[model samples]
Target: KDKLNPPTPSIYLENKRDAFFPPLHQFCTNPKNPVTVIRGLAGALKLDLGLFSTKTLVEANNEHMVEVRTQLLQPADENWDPTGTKKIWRCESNRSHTTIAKYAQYQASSFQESLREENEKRKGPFKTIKFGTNIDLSDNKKWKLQLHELTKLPAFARVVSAGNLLTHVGHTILGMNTVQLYMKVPGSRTPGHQENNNFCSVNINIGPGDCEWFVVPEDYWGVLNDFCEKNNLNFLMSSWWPNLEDLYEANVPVYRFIQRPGDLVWINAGTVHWVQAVGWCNNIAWNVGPLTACQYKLAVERYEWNKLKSVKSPVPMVHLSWNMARNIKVSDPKLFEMIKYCLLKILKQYQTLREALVAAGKEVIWHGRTNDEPAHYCSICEVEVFNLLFVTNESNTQKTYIVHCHDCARKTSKSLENFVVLEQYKMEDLIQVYDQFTLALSLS
Candidate 1:
């Protein structure tokens, strides 16, 4: 089921063979830029597989994820940035059964190309081929944002979900978003792909199948990007690189691996990789926050390209920064400042761009988030946000009218700037950042 073009050496690493991820997943969880592979992870995770155990899912009317497959060649047409590169997909255990069924049926019929009985009822073999699905991007009367917001912080040490992505799990290791159910048939060739955030995909081979991935390390991201630019492509496109041979011809370093159940694959941020599966194969994949500094860099870079390509998730780069900052309790003040500074750079640039677009009278929205769930705010305040919404003592109609949250927008605010709804900690955040800049100001 797997097809990797232009075969190349894969940077594959089985666990310490001695170190199983479920038990030592952390020891293997490196936030660096290279690719990481760990085996026998989900095998240790006691998740209720029934949610994805195939036909039983349909019979039980449990979480039914429609499986779909697509194939082809050439560079002009390909669909990518699925489920996670953006916030387009995630694991769904709890949602109105009615809604899930309706969507699956509607989607299947629309894309299946089958003349099946139009009864619109599916009992088994639930699958579809429609990509980047947004039933109604403009409106969602049944707005079900995020199953629920992540309101808790990560413990000091964490993996999968970044160490600070606020969520219900309280523990970073447990927090997650976008758990996509991948059901591979006999002929499916998963495309080579990377993500906006880190991903920890656990293989649950219900049909007892085999899976494989053709991967490229982060070091080669620029090399690949250089190639992509020369050709004008959004690497996210499934067929951006025709075959592994082509990659090898260019001296591109590529890696390959075959993973079975009880095995887990850690595809780091910006580490381009694609997979393949045998029939009846199911993979429960989840998108996570940056687990380390290098991982964070990948996230930041990918986001830039995502923004440029406009294939973005509901979560914005700045908001991610805000959330991390609000939740982070790092001991290294310098590191914290550095992290905050990096975040601010992205936030500033994003706002500047939004300000440009808004100036043109276009109200930008993050996918279906507002209706999906009250657009992700400054992460800190959990208020609606995108770019910096400032609140200043301006004459109202002023270079930029300050953007603000409902609270700051209404109340009398400070003069420097009150872009977002602010709390005392925010000032502290700014002060900490100020201190960093001041020290560096001397260097400049």
Candidate 2:
């Protein structure tokens, strides 16, 4: 693979920075180096760690039990953050009182509408809505909204265990956001982490800490892969964040960006990056909004497998993709078409299976979805099904059937003779609804 120089985030300044609004698809092409930054997209962050009287949030006052686990950057000598690796689920909500009542009290309705359709008039302006605390991306769009908030200071004060996050915080990712805080450990060298491990990412830096980034792109993966394959360097790809030196002596188009407080840095999906936080820094990073057609398809296809593998996703790929497809169906013509093509193609597979099942004496039961437990799942794999419906056998008596996603319906051989569809779409109508379901416009 030839070294293609992927650019770091282009900035907007008094003269040097002009606001440019290009379609997001281009960023997907260079997954290895997709990134964008705004001068302090995150700022004046404040959180009161001692306000734990509510959820038992520990105070950062040195007296409280402050235990840090999970991710970071730079290299450290003695390993700060007390608890690491082995003890990953450490928290504030994870702190004292972790519950819906507790998490709900901190939620605000405005945070819930970040991506709502009616409020989407900020044209030429891109938006990314981030929900918090293990939200299922496939669940209710608005309900998920209530389930989380974008790090509100005073509200968060009630639960700042690790005591790190934006006072006025934000959105969701194609994957999960890497929430982090950095107040430089003297003489420490923090390593790097990758985003997308599947989608592009934006790393936001809030002021007072100077940060640096070293990134290697996707095109070079095969180049590096071949070397590793022949040399038995298979261990290199196992973890998302491998040390930069271990990969190679830093390839060009390899990027370096200085992250000052009050700015954002976007990295394309599949891009390998190492972050360096210097002198008291805090940052929160993740993917924001949709990727291109190709990237989006890759994400869902991977989700299918991840679902089978029982890997958890912030939202089911099936749900998230459908919701996004519906949201943009009216506003962005090109993007809408792209989503329709990919989604319908996948949905079509279920339509075919429905036919086979029907021939096998199966019945069709159509159930509309509301803000409740999932109504459809692949009977065999037990994964959620979206517009692409699925079915079961006990459906014969009560008329209400088991919903199987196409994944299982397509591959199952254990006598689908009585397998019925949970939804009432014949092959033609399924295709029609796939079009109509994705259509949803104010075409009044």
Candidate 3:
């Protein structure tokens, strides 16, 4: 039987001061150095710059190299340098001195190869991006003009003008009026393809005006279709996109949307989006798109990327993609609903656990268990559970007994007794049951 769901009503544009709406004056003009303000803001905000800029180059000549030479440096030997006569020095104190210089040179040369490639790969997209006014926050008094104080300051009016002017030139409104901040975390040091360690970093996004909010529908089955019908957009499920297929088994709809700072947006289910790094500004954003999507997407992406790219046991991209894509299904509404429900529950549990830990003055530790496996008993039922018994006053020494609950003990015994093992069930079955029992015991 086909389910009947109505499209959501059109949200009225309220002119209230505190209401959320995409800023009207996203692009504006600056009086002084109009081009600089125009180009800088566009570049910082991740706006599409229609025309390409002239390519600039700095040759690696002897004279040019001497100007930027550092004292705390090591000269390249015969093996290090291809040209024995050319003395290449490594800057010891200057972090990323020669590295960044070389990267700029490579980017310049790469830029001239293909305009399309440069625009798609190099010019912006993946590059670190930020948006803000020309006003520098270094000055203590002038710091008040930073993105955070946009609503309070008159200078914000001028910045809004600059944004408006740029908007005239085909710049898609990624965000508006709100201040954006970005910082680059150094990745790999290996020449062209630099990789940064995926260290967990705190990302705080505050939107303009009051907080924005949304609630998931009571029935998750047709949530995606309902959202699409309401928003007038199509829903596409692809395993290769965010690479969620390998991590999650159920059919989930991921929708992508842009949030106007002052406008109220509703996200029902199966929405996929990312707040490009450039939109990190001073104001607090609530229940916004991309930010929420990226958090979960990032976890799944990192887990998959690490699993495939790790040095020890690397999985091929083709196999990984295939594994994820094979299970795609759009027919099962209950499965879709269940997955959506589980995701929300997991996120809520994470939040509640964090708050509870903070309240108990206990620091949360992530990335696997502290002790070695087999030495401790772990189990998962409806909930995760773990148990450890320590002998504190044993003849000037301490000992610990790690044991699992009855269900885990039974499962483990059965697994050991089995002759032929299914590849998928071997590790996951144990981990799931162990985790559930462990969590249950901990809570108790």
Candidate 4:
């Protein structure tokens, strides 16, 4: 092949800056440069001689932790700065401590309502409530209000873990406001620059009459703006330090605006802002912020950090492709085909049940099946029947029956005949027999 056709060396020029820039332009070159002759003479149009590639645009103080005290704000309390208040509730009563239950109840009712709304939406407007107000402790909704519950915290930790997984997969979650509160300190430069990873502490007051706001400084505004532009970020103010001058000064922009319960504020991080405190304030906030920083740390240990870093584009899409190519093909195709067939059968069974129920004018109380655990045979059987009767295309047309004498001679003869018929008939033919049998029963 090499001898038959000589290969030509192609020269291509690309713009180097385009790699680093957001918008890229491309140019091509060949040994014979094409030039246009203008006017009477030939004028050479010099190419910029480059190709532009598309450029993809991609802390926490502890005293800050101390100042923010992660408290639950009360709904009816007027003294609290409406702008910087968040109510915390628990999904489950902490049987161990009164403190947990006391706080959980305050937020539990509202959180439950929120969960109900979300669940109702997911289940459709007409769906009969399967799981009632009494939710399982392990249900995710239990974590909505009082996330500090040990059971609930795991879900939060899982959220963090998932965020980490996403980052490893090349996605970033910028902000998470599970619990909210504000930070307060005396001066602008107070504990200004700590070690890069060091945790800092700031004092913040919660309760009535302690309202103030903290605004993001203009210089540091890039962090907030960049995140907002890139990810459509939102922020929640937890407190407005009324008495604290520096805190108040820092949050000058949002001094008068108070965010209420169920209110969402979309603001770039580092936007200079503060909360305004009035009498008897219950300070708390649940801000939905990014989950990237912690996720990045987790990804480093669990995944190939260098590989993840090398992924400059969308990570999940690439990872999914890699996974399917590597893992899915290894499974037996025949087994998969069998599974598909059985699944179709199960769906058909459910469809029949649904139709039967509709004919009877009775509400069908169908349930889901377990993917694992052989012990759930009853449930699985119900699910199979439901699928076949309701979801399947075939309508009540499949059935089977066997009748044979217990006497050895008769049984033997019957078995021989059945074997011969089975061997001679195709599966489709068997299905037709079953269908006819079922139709006869349905009519009867």
Candidate 5:
């Protein structure tokens, strides 16, 4: 009798930090030690860690009702964009608000009815996908407490906690210190995409069930983008999921796995991933912008690329960079250098944009952006407009301003009479901020 060797374990059985594989591939390990969690996560490891024993997370905020979205999985061809050039997926705008327990019961009933139909040899009705995503749990103090305790690691405190630079413009930058809840029934899915602003994400399967995940590494991101564009599929906001055969043909590596209850999955920054619910499940997720050269580089690169492609930058890197430099101090040489370099480039860009606006005899408002105010992106092109804002009074009756970038503003009006230019920061103030950062590093 021939007995085959057991399939190689995805998770390391060892209780040490160094037992897991490199961050390049999806690996599973039990974070027995807190340092193991920090080291593995910071290295951008696509980690699948163990155990969520606490009822705080798994309970799904029983006291509150959440908004749930409905997706038409079997969308008609007519539902898609006629040109197949845009992101035209079948999702309804009228979301349903329900308690998690109620939704779970409904899903259970549907599954049972389907099973009954199968036994009776009758055709069952089509299933509609219902998922509650980005469900706010900030009011749940226990949820926040658990996350804070887990993410309280060395060198990560500033970016993950209340001390985050993004916290100043708190409401604008969602999912920092706070967490979002996701609940899905079977057939529910998250389309192929990277996290907002390419920040590394953490998801805990606070489940009564499991979900399937398909991940493509950051290295193959360019190839994936090419494949999507060539196929006329949306690149980042892709509706089309990559088939195993197609990915193999394109020579792109993919990692497929199922996440069960009590498992923690850490997705690396810039990695493209898709998820489908294999069972009715609840998950808590949040993004972490680590203070590392790799994370900062990827975040900034995507920020610029989003601008070129006329997509809005969710986390304004330019604004965040200055904010980070002003508030956070780094111990690592590489992090310090990266922040310094970004600040320098920001200052240079601001000077050039400001100079051109003033030299053209355009009136510049001295109104700098306040800490509470969110960063502005061009209304026409969706490009981030930092330092200098080109405001157009579209309606004379109201004070509403439609902002445009330097280029879009010029393209909109040749006379420049209707546009009001507002600067975010004074040149002297920016220079002083940069100086303080560098001087502090030197002193350290």
Candidate 6:
């Protein structure tokens, strides 16, 4: 028996959570809750997650009144500041309409007439861009994007229900959880920039035409930042449209590609991208904050950097992290560790700041912030003001309360006079929440 029946070999199968590929169980088949896809595959394609095609999409609401940007009839990127005002028009979506039937109509007449018209002020043609992403389609039932009608590109699923971390938290936190629509004509371009607070984004061209994209991976961010700094340009690419030759000379690896009608483009976390419309097209885009280590790392880094530079962080990373710690549980060890680290860091900082304030004879007041209240930022440095707030009342036409961080509060007035420290969270409650989250993680 011993000779004939050898000991049964140890049966081994593939690991469920392979480092190279996400587990089969991790694949988001529940169309309702699209779980975070494979991190390895997503990060591997630095610029994009590849393009997907939809069979067809609905036509634009020709009656919808959209805000349109009238591009200056000048060379590209010349004195273009995204923050700065450009000529804007309130126009109907049908003004820039282009389809197979419309194409034939144009060809019968002057094909180029609709887009053309020489101006005395400038030698080139004028451009009008319709970027209609302002309204939150989730909150506004009356408003809808063209792509939503026919097919569901799971990748571009509305962020509100797309299993985004922010969505799960149930707070719109900087309006990052919604789908926005874009309509563009030839010469309409979106300057180089990362998505809102470096969250992963999806853009689907539900078009009558095509669009082009130029993007740089997150790895090349430092190189690109240095190049912009050296040239005295905006590192965020807000005001500066990059010169392709100059970027190549600087050894920056740029990914250039085209997005045709029905193509969905997934921009990776923190990737810098610029877009242009080759023809009349409609696009819908939104950002997703996946509950993953990769996303949290980039988001926190960007938040800290924004503070150092006095830039307002749109997503309020520090506040959101603490909120997430209290609300979410993660099976991924790395992700869990990151959230735990952030929670601990926040707890430590708060304890230290509170001690110092108490020693300095600053009174901590009880002012519980309502859930509906928007997150506060420092009036001076623009840094996020968290649970412990330093508020000073400014007397003008009316008494206005301005919130500041401890650092900015001291910088403004040495005495800390007329400043109130409002403690939004009880130290005990925060500590308990952290412990409970960790316990839940262990059990799961």
Q: Name the top TM-score candidate.
A: 5
Task: For residues 96-201, write the lDDT of model 4, one tens digit per residue.
Answer: 2122223233333544565688789741111111110111112235333333321222121222333222322223322221233322111101111111111111
- By lDDT, who's the top model here? 5
Sequence-dependent TM-score of model 6: 0.71
TM-score, structure 2 vs. true: 0.54
Name the candidate, 3 or 5, with the larger lDDT value: 5
Cα lDDT, model 3, residue 271? 23
Q: Could you tell me how far off, in angstroms, the CA of residue 414 lies in candidate 3 after the best superposition?
A: 8.8
Each model's TM-score, in the order given?
Answer: 0.55, 0.54, 0.21, 0.20, 0.73, 0.71
> Model 2, range 130-248, lDDT digits (tens) per residue?
11222222223422321243344222121121211111012233224333322232122333333432555555454344676666665555555444455444423232234334444
Per-residue error for 166 in candidate 2, Å, reads: 20
Overall lDDT per candidate, in order of appearance = 0.43, 0.43, 0.25, 0.25, 0.62, 0.58
Worst 10 residues of 5 by lDDT: 28-37
Question: Which regions of candidate 6 deviate over 4 angstroms?
Answer: 1-67, 72-139, 144-157, 173-175, 393-401, 439-444
Model 2 segments more than 4 A misplaced:
1-7, 12-33, 40-197, 223-237, 240-253, 291-327, 330-337, 371-384, 387-413, 416-421, 424-429, 433-444
lDDT (Cα) of model 1? 0.43
Q: Which ten residues in a row have the lowest lDDT in candidate 2?
A: 160-169
Pick by TM-score: 1 or 5, better one: 5
- In candidate 6, clashing pairs total 0
lDDT of 3 at 150: 35
Which is better, 1 or 3, measured by TM-score? 1
